């Protein structure tokens, strides 16, 4: 009935979130081994690329929701949108992205990811061009709280409404339970134009994951629960696919059983 | 021969395989053209077999990137000790090895089989069995009883012959010599400079025989080849860099009759 406590537990916990430990855990090998095609890294990139390759998802503006310190989620996207907004709750994540944007050395190195995207998009693009294009198309990096009814604040910088939304491993990772999840989904939906698209990626049946000192709580959701929430928010589900986590990628960083990918189109 | 004694491998790599000639991002550059020729040729599935030899490899490996998934036993060669050492460093992942990874990535891009560049390099490294001395001026260019499995099912050679040959006839004999290493029905992929006469490798100033496409064709024919394919890349102004006077590059696919 009342959300404050749960939300406050969530904000408290993320106060200990360590971005480098998160990157190492989920984006360095073995999870970051893009050489095995049966691995989660290549499956993620594939979903994005295949989705954008339909040409059916385009426009001027895009908002990435809960970017964290990662950019892979925008590699295939950046060729289809002039204007990209990145976002995160945590300043320390916003700074991490700042470092990649300034092309500093001390930044996380996404080049294997960039190269792989270029590889599977099959336009023969070099990875440096791809990266240079993402850095150009990222127009701002903003604070976000998906629990607020206006997740970006009032009269925010972001072009509203966006033609498309991307969100990866955010909603379920910051929502104490399924009702919270649903509301978060409902809040971000106010940012998308009617007829626009949402690409949603996340963890299935996950209850915790590590990010350094911080052990964080996740609402474990199923595919059927994700579909239902999407429908319940005013979306037509165009695609919902599931990746089952192989034992060898279950590393003790979380209890994730699998990953879901959703392409949904806002009805209107 | 004495001219090749002053030959600095890093200065050659830097002059030809680093920017601008080594920027693989523009598809109109000489780098991408070369890899495209190699890749396209192997993708035909007609250049196949068990053993292959690369003639005058110098300190470079790119010429085998697409090849290496078609031949389980690979032999690399060069006249100079220093080049053989520079190859060693990259094969053995040693310190101060040249970084070929942009080229690996591009072969993977071009071949379009969704391969990661690390697997490509791994396979190449595994399939190169030996790096041997060679002198194409010799009738048996490899010497008497070489470690190399002869005759080979195929041959590669890039920028070697025209660059070790004073004139057309010295060039034609060199071709005749290496052609003896190639099993009849075998395949030659030959790449070289068009109408070039000199190029620099650090302190070394090397002499080259200026050859034309028609000259290259006639030579392969006279050596006993059926020219399956012969293409030319004209050298753009922006890639004419003071390190030589190459006018174009040629790629030849030939098959010993
Ligand atoms: N109340 C809130 N509203 C929106 N984002 C939040 C939030 N609380 C935490 N986050 C962000 O949720 C992210 C989960 S990590 C996901 C990182 C990136 N999307 C990738 O795909 O891996 C963290 O960056 C965290 O800071
Ligand atoms: N008499 C000879 N017989 C065989 N190779 C020779 C030779 N004299 C010089 N070479 C080698 O010919 C090479 C020319 S340059 C290296 C070409 C390399 N394959 C690439 O594609 O760039 C040098 O490595 C040089 O040392
Ligand atoms: Cl397997 C996997 C991949 C990425 C993730 N981000 C958060 N949890 C994850 C789990
Ligand atoms: Cl443009 C170019 C590329 C490779 C070469 N090797 C010898 N001369 C060259 C010239």
UniProtKB/Swiss-Prot annotation, chain A:
Q: Which reaction does it catalyse?
A: phenylethanolamine + S-adenosyl-L-methionine = N-methylphenylethanolamine + S-adenosyl-L-homocysteine + H(+); (R)-noradrenaline + S-adenosyl-L-methionine = (R)-adrenaline + S-adenosyl-L-homocysteine + H(+); (R)-normetanephrine + S-adenosyl-L-methionine = (R)-metanephrine + S-adenosyl-L-homocysteine + H(+); (R)-octopamine + S-adenosyl-L-methionine = (R)-synephrine + S-adenosyl-L-homocysteine + H(+)
**What is one cellular component GO term in this UniProt entry?**
cytosol
Describe the effect of residue 99 to C. Answer: No significant effect on protein expression and enzyme activity with octopamine as substrate
Query: Outcome of residue 254 to A/N?
Result: Strongly reduced enzyme activity towards phenylethanolamine. Decreases affinity for phenylethanolamine 200-fold. Decreases affinity for S-adenosyl-L-methionine 3-fold
Residues that coordinate or bind octopamine: 206, 254
- InterPro entries on file: NNMT/PNMT/TEMT_CS, NNMT_TEMT_trans, SAM-dep_methyltransferase, SAM-dependent_MTases_sf
**Which top-level group of life is the source organism from?**
Eukaryota
| GO terms of biological process kind | catecholamine biosynthetic process; epinephrine biosynthetic process; methylation
Signal peptide segment: none
Q: In which pathway does it act?
A: Catecholamine biosynthesis; (R)-adrenaline biosynthesis; (R)-adrenaline from (R)-noradrenaline: step 1/1
Q: What is its EC number?
A: 2.1.1.28
Describe the effect of residue 22 to F.
Strongly increases KM for phenylethanolamine and S-adenosyl-L-methionine
Q: Where does S-adenosyl-L-methionine bind?
A: 22, 27, 66-67, 72, 88, 93, 145-146, 168
Which key words are in the record? Catecholamine biosynthesis, Methyltransferase, Phosphoprotein, S-adenosyl-L-methionine, Transferase
Q: From the UniProt record, which GO molecular function terms apply?
A: phenylethanolamine N-methyltransferase activity
- Keyword Phosphoprotein carried by entry: yes
Main role? Catalyzes the transmethylation of nonepinephrine (noradrenaline) to form epinephrine (adrenaline), using S-adenosyl-L-methionine as the methyl donor. Other substrates include phenylethanolamine and octopamine. Also methylates normetanephrine.
Per the similarity annotation, which family is this? Answer: Belongs to the class I-like SAM-binding methyltransferase superfamily. NNMT/PNMT/TEMT family.
Q: Tell me the protein's name.
A: Phenylethanolamine N-methyltransferase
Tell me what organism the protein belongs to: Homo sapiens (Human)
